[PDB]
């Protein structure tokens, strides 16, 4: 018996890639991710209006966790841009993206994947900073957003240079999240498993919890990208995108879940690892 999402993407890899995570604080000594995530000194969070590290700990586990991770050989570096309530700022995220590029210039390693499991409204400056970091050779993966809306109205989802990931469930259908659900439209690059994802729970050192969202879906694509770049390190961003589409399951999403005008614009692709 394996978590459904790990079976869905399979038709210790990712060791050549470092995955940066801009999220809440992380419980770095949880058994699922201990020794796999290096916590940077970076913190830039707004004041608030076991739970502080819930979101980031689960996502670190989805990417590289011992028992339930996608790219179990990848190393991760974490930056805290979301406060205890999961809220951050565009400026804090900009400073974090600049910190990643500064860190890379000071001590270069192999291919870098940056996971942005967050969203705000369309931001010219956040899209420009993502565009610049992607043009600099870094791979960015972001959540499409959980607003049951057009991803082009949110950032970094609307940045064309970022790999924007929507969420699908075990029936390969778009995830519902309360009254809302995955975003869609022409700014989404592909979908990935984002419902009932088993992953590290920060409640205890061996606890696991299932979570749903486009952040979980984006973490799956960050893990798949880490595996793909480790196997073929010379891939450009355009080639990595070609591979993600190529190895994806095609036309399995029932496009009737999307609004009528978004059906031809939304890619009908569910991510998967190469065989």
């Amino acid at each position: 018996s394996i978590p459904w999402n790990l079976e869905r993407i399979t038709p210790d890899g990712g060791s050549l890639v470092e995955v940066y995570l801009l999220d809440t604080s992380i419980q770095s000594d949880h058994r699922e991710i201990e020794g796999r995530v290096m916590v940077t000194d970076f913190e830039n969070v707004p004041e608030e209006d076991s739970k502080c590290d819930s979101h980031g700990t689960h996502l670190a586990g989805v990417v590289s966790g011992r028992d339930a991770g996608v790219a179990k050989g990848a190393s991760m570096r974490s930056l805290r841009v979301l406060n205890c309530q999961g809220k951050g700022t565009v400026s804090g995220t900009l400073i974090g993206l600049e910190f990643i590029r500064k860190s890379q210039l000071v001590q270069p390693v192999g291919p870098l994947v940056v996971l942005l499991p967050l969203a705000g409204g369309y931001s010219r400056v956040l899209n420009a900073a993502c565009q610049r970091l992607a043009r600099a050779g870094v791979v960015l993966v972001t959540a499409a957003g959980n607003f049951r809306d057009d991803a082009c109205l949110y950032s970094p989802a609307s940045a064309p240079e970022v790999i924007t990931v929507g969420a699908t469930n075990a029936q390969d259908q778009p995830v519902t999240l309360g009254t809302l659900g995955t975003n869609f439209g022409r700014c989404v690059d592909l979908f990935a498993p984002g419902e009932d994802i088993i992953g590290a729970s920060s409640d205890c050192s061996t606890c696991f919890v299932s979570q749903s969202g486009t952040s979980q879906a984006a973490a799956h694509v960050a893990g798949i990208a880490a595996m793909m770049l480790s196997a073929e390190p010379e891939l450009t961003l355009a080639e990595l995108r070609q591979r993600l589409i190529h190895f994806s399951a095609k036309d399995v999403i029932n496009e009737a879940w999307f609004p009528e005008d978004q059906r031809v614009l939304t890619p009908n692709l569910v991510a998967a690892l190469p065989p």
Partner: protein
């Protein structure tokens, strides 16, 4: 040609903090001079400002905590491409 932008989702706006984005290829030294220049011009008008951060590496510019009353003046600073009011992002 310098423009002002703020989040279209009004509850997510964070007024009082602005990201001043300078033209591509503006150097760190030029961004620091532009930030000092805004602080001097605002102080002559009786306004207190704070330069929270100076950007370089991806985008040239700076993060400033100031009254939005200073935006018309800030858009006339040398090297300015655009200014964006800070806004919230959320865990997905």
């Amino acid at each position: 040609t310098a423009t002002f932008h703020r989040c279209a989702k009004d509850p997510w706006r964070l007024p009082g903090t602005y990201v001043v984005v300078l033209k591509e290829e503006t150097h760190l030294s030029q961004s620091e001079r532009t930030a000092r220049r805004l602080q001097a011009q605002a102080a002559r008008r009786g306004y207190l400002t704070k330069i929270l951060h100076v950007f370089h590496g991806l985008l040239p510019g700076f993060l400033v905590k100031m009254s939005g009353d200073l935006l018309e003046l800030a858009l006339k600073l040398p090297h300015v491409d655009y200014i964006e009011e800070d806004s919230s992002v959320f865990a997905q």
